[PDB]
Write a protein that binds this ligand. Structure first.
Ligand SMILES: COCCCC/C(=N/OCCN)c1ccc(C(F)(F)F)cc1
Ligand code: NA
Ligand code: NA
Length: 499
């Protein structure tokens, strides 16, 4: 079985996964909409009562399974719980990242394409007024994606956008086919520094942004000025818990696959706590210092609420590009921004697609080449649904991330900490650990963490269970994916009986 070479690279790859577009875009929006600086109160608590405990568990399950030559949840759940229902629930952790990858890699290709178009100067040039600046870029994005003009739910992406997607896939395969250490870990040692440099530079250039409408100081002002009156809203505490899941990448079975390449007695306590902190630092220090400030600096603090309500996607694919076409040398700033984003996603997309690569290796005994080429084949095929069918992207995100963070994460708790046994579990986490997990966390892992995860589920349940016909096309496919994966798991246990 393959293994991580260095402890540094391990943390960088785990952080590589955790840090992506959400750190720079999603997180700053959630904070401003939910109390600003006051949002740091429930966010840190959730980091301590949910994020950190659950992180350690996925690291534990991974290493525990990796020592037995299994990196995925269909096998691992069957090791924590000798049952048929454990193998089925395990498929979900093979299904979730595979669904995300069907849309995630494609959006990752957008950043790359934009980065290319921005670098060569193939971008709109306005013209005055805010809608006169945004519209040439709103339309720039819509022509790349192929946003439907008529009533049809049909997208028509550009040939270029399609070609960049093919290139993005090829890049992923390039890194992935070289393996854990010589591919992912090697690239994680190059990307993360390159990422940090790009962030710092953008942070610096943004703080220098001065327009007649405002400054960057007004941006960091609006974003971080605490509104404690919003702490009364349960929805703020719900968003915070949800944000931590999203921030750390919990409930997608990605960590579990990675940790399974960590050796039997190597530390997972301190190593995890490090990679987790790197992401949080990247979010609060770098991510919340670029997007929102630059948005407020150009449009003023008067539109700061409107900007945050416009969503994270508009902020990063329309708003910020439009601001860049108005600043000195902003076309290169557009390129550094989209190249910052491209790497952030790429370090995540190679991480997520590994689970399916691991399965084909560990359970179906496929070579690494075949495992990558078929995984690439599957994600490439399924992506055509995202590329051509309008709102298919949303349906996949809803089901994958929805079930992923709200169902499957809780399942990891119960199986490992309630079915497999809390004491046996606790030893598996602390074993070989440089530092030991605080004795208080035993109660947080066993009660507090699943109690929260139950509530996040239920509130999510009570709102989304009640909440067009073409959505069935996407549902039809992703269900077909689950059946397909059940079948592979089925074939996996039948090959093992023969040998
Ligand atoms: C809402 O956008 C999708 C996020 C799902 C979780 C995500 N975490 O990555 C870094 C944490 N912020 C993720 C999961 C799977 C994949 C992959 F596409 F690689 F499977 C990529 C990102
Ligand atoms: Na993150
Ligand atoms: Na990443």
């Amino acid at each position: 079985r393959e293994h991580w070479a260095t402890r540094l690279g391990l943390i960088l790859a785990m952080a590589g996964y955790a840090v992506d577009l959400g750190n720079f875009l999603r997180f700053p929006v959630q904070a401003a909409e939910n109390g600003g600086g006051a949002f740091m109160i429930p966010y840190i608590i959730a980091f301590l009562l949910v994020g950190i405990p659950l992180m350690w568990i996925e690291w534990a399950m991974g290493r525990y399974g990796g020592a037995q030559g299994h990196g995925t949840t269909p096998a691992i759940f069957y090791l924590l719980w000798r049952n048929r229902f454990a193998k089925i629930l395990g498929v979900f952790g093979l299904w979730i990242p595979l669904v995300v990858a069907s849309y995630y890699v494609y959006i990752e290709s957008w950043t790359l394409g934009f980065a290319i178009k921005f670098l060569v100067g193939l971008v709109p040039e306005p013209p005055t007024d805010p809608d006169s600046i945004l519209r040439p870029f709103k339309e720039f994005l819509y022509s790349y994606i192929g946003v439907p003009k008529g009533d049809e739910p049909i997208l028509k992406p550009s040939l270029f956008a399609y070609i960049v997607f093919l290139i993005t896939m090829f890049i992923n395969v390039s890194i992935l086919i070289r393996g854990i250490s010589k591919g992912i870990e090697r690239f994680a040692k190059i990307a993360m520094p390159t990422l940090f440099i790009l962030a710092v530079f953008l942070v610096i250039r943004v703080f220098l942004l001065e327009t007649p409408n405002g400054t960057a100081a007004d941006g960091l002002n609006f974003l971080w000025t605490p509104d404690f009156e919003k702490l009364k809203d349960p929805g703020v505490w719900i968003a915070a818990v949800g944000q931590i899941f999203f921030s750390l990448g919990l409930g997608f079975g990605v960590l579990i696959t990675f940790a399974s390449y960590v050796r039997k007695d190597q530390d997972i306590v301190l190593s995890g706590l490090t990679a987790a902190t790197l992401n949080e630092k990247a979010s609060v220090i770098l991510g919340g210092s670029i997007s929102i400030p630059a948005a407020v600096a150009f449009f003023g603090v008067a539109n700061a609420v409107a900007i945050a309500k416009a969503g994270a996607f508009n902020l990063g694919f329309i708003t910020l590009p439009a601001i860049f076409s108005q600043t000195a040398g902003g076309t290169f700033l557009g390129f550094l921004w989209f190249f910052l984003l491209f790497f952030a996603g790429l370090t995540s997309s190679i991480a997520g697609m590994q689970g399916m690569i691991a399965f084909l290796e560990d359970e179906l005994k496929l070579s690494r080449k075949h495992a990558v080429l078929w995984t690439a084949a599957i994600v490439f095929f399924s992506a055509h649904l995202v590329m051509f069918l309008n709102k298919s992207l949303d349906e996949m995100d809803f089901w994958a991330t929805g079930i992923g963070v709200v169902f499957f994460g809780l399942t990891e708790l119960i199986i490992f900490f309630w079915i497999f046994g809390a004491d046996k579990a606790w030893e598996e986490i602390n074993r070989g650990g440089i530092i030991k997990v605080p004795r208080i966390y035993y109660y947080v892992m066993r009660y507090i963490t699943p109690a929260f995860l139950a509530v996040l589920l239920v509130v999510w349940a009570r709102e989304y269970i009640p909440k067009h016909w073409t959505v069935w096309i996407t549902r039809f496919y992703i269900i077909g994916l689950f059946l397909f994966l059940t079948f592979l798991v089925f074939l996996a246990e039948r090959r093992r009986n023969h040998e």
